[PDB]
Amino acid sequence: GSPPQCQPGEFACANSRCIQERWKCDGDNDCLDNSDEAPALCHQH
Ligand SMILES: [Ca+2]
To answer: Which family does it belong to?
Structure first.
């Protein structure tokens, strides 16, 4: 119920990646697996 994901408030990519919360609703694949930009997380379009 408290996901850190890289630092205490970031993004975990299903490719297997810690990157930063910018990428969440940024609208690029960014993750390369496009985790954030599938609406399991957000998807800016
Ligand atoms: Ca993104």
So the answer is: Belongs to the LDLR family.
